[PDB]
Amino acid sequence: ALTQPPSVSGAPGQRVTISCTGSSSNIGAGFDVHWYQQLPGTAPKLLIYGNSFRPSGVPDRFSGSKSGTSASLAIAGLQAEDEADYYCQSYDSSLSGVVFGGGTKLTVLGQPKAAPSVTLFPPSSEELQANKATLVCLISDFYPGAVTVAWKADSSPVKAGVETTTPSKQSNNKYAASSYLSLTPEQWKSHRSYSCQVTHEGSTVEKTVAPT
Amino acid sequence: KNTRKSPALIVWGIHHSVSTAEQTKLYGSGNKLVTVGSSNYQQSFVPSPGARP
Amino acid sequence: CGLLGTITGPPQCDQFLEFSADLIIERREGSDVCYPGKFVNEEALRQILRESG
């Protein structure tokens, strides 16, 4: 039960904040919150411990704090060596064990701020015959590389049936990601329309499909 | 039992946890209570679990 | 009879429950209690009862 945002941007040198939202069973109790930095492929290094203390060889740039039921990490003086995933970690009593966060993808800039570029394909007839249905949501040419998809059937979100891919570097050095939705054929037919909405940092980009 | 001829010096401690939850983590739910007593000493100790700096 | 036992009244102190004196003489063999225990701020109450008459 520790909630961190998915992504945060930032230009070299600017200051950025990462939030570690917790409940009363983990940070609300007397338990301390630590942070960990995971560079690509590398294993996590210990970062801020004891909510504000940093171990040897950690710059002043990284500064931790904690307030009530949440914690916060602060990075000032962004460099390329800082682009990584960051995790907060504390202890929970109602679960009787330690707990980590979801992680936050720190993207340092140095590129434009392009967005998707979503294209959505509805189920093909040939697969409806085989008693199957799968909608295909494609995303290309976006920077930085961290999106958040959400599927709807003309009003209502769909929690199950969704498989979402990890972004990866394009040849055009940008990022690319796809997400597929699995449906039964009559579920596809017995609805007005469907929509794959994709949120990049501050923009929702949505497509739409209707049975014909 | 102080089996010797000089007087003995007995020293113990009380653990003040950071919260009512950490105390249940270490020792379990319930009120924690230490009772010390000799032929002339009669006291009792209770931890004070709560927030601190 | 211990001096504090003149208040609580263990058996040894039955004869002093309502004593009256100008000079109160304590002994080493005094026992303020029969069921074990001890008074809080016992020396203060002792100093009170010594000048009590």
One-letter amino acid at A142 equals F
Specify the 3-state DSSP secondary structure of A153. strand
Q: Strand pairing of A156-157 and A148-153?
A: antiparallel
* Interior angle at CA A87, CA B50 and CA A5, nearest 5: 95
Q: Does C35 touch chain B (CB under 8 A)?
A: no
How far from the centroid of its chain's Cα atoms is residue B13's Cα?
5
- Chain B CB contacts of A22 under 8 Å are none
Q: Do chains B and A touch (3 or more CB pairs under 8 A)?
A: yes
Mention every residue, 6+ apart, whose C-beta is less than 8 A from residue B21.
A25, A29, A30, A31, A93
Q: Which residue has the tokens 């966060």?
A: A101
Give residue A33's identity as a one-letter amino acid code: V
Residue of chain A whose alpha carbon sits nearest to that of B18: A30
d(CA A167, CA A65): 31
Token pair, residue A8, equals: 């945060």
**Does residue B51 sit at the A interface (CB-CB below 8 Å)?**
yes
Q: Which residue of C has its CA nearest to B40?
A: C38
Query: Cβ–Cβ contacts within 10 Å for residue A147, how many?
Result: 22
Taking the C-alpha atoms of residue A120 and residue A150, their distance in angstroms, rounded to an integer, is 13
Q: Quick one: which of A202, A127, A195 has its CA closest to A157?
A: A195
**CB pair distance less than 8 Å for B24 and A93:** yes
- Whether residue A30 and residue B19 make contact (CB cut-off 8 A), yes or no, is yes
CA–CA distance, B19 with A143 (Å, rounded to integer): 44
Query: In this complex, is the C-beta atom of B42 within 8 Å of any C-beta atom belonging to chain C?
Result: yes
Q: Give a three-class secondary structure readout of A70-97.
A: EEEEEEECCCHHHCCEEEEEEEECCCCE
Which residues of chain C make contact with B42, given a CB cutoff of 8 A? Answer: 36-38
Amino acid at A37: Q
Do residue A30 and residue B25 have CB atoms under 8 angstroms apart?
no
Angle at A63 between CA A61 and CA A67, to 5 degrees: 160
- Quick check: A156 and A193 in contact, CB under 8 A? no
Against chain C, the chains showing at least 3 CB pairs within 8 Å are B
- Domains in chain A (CATH in brackets) are 1-110 (2.60.40.10), 111-212 (2.60.40.10)
H and E: helices and strands count for chain C: 2, 0
A125-140 burial: b if 16+ Cβ within 10 Å, else e: eeebeeeebbbbbbbb
CA A198: distance to chain centroid? Answer: 12
Q: Quick check: A148 and A168 in contact, CB under 8 A? A: no
Question: Could you give the residue ranges of the DSSP H alpha helices within A14-122?
Answer: none
Give the technique used to solve this structure: X-ray
Short-list A64, A10, A12, A16, CA closest to A36: A64
Q: What tokens were used for A55? A: 């171990």
Q: In Å, what resolution does this model reach?
A: 3.5
C43 touches chain B (CB under 8 A): no
- The rounded distance, in Å, linking the Cα atoms of A147 and A144 is 9
CB pairs under 8 A between B and C: 4
Write phi, then psi, for C15 (nearest 5 degrees).
Answer: -75, -5
Which residues in chain C are followed by a discontinuity, with C-to-N distance exceeding 2.5 angstroms?
none
Within a 10 A sphere around the Cβ of A180, how many other Cβ atoms?
16
Residue C48 and residue C32: Cα distance in Å, rounded?
15
- B-chain residues within 8 Å CB-CB of C36? 42
Check: CB of residue A150 under 8 Å from CB of residue A157. Answer: yes
Nearest CA-CA distance, residue A29 and chain B, Å: 6
List the 4-43 stretch of B: residues with Cβ below 8 A of A.
Answer: 17-22, 24-25
CB < 8 Å to B49, chain A: 30
A96 interfacial to chain B (CB closer than 8 Å)? yes
Which one of B36, B38, B41, B42 makes the best mutation probe of the C interface by having the most chain C beta carbons within 10 Å? B42
What lies within 8 Å, CB to CB, of C20 at 6+ separation is: C53
> How would you write A159-190 as a 3-class SS string?
CCCEEECCCEECCCCCEEEEEEEEECHHHHHC
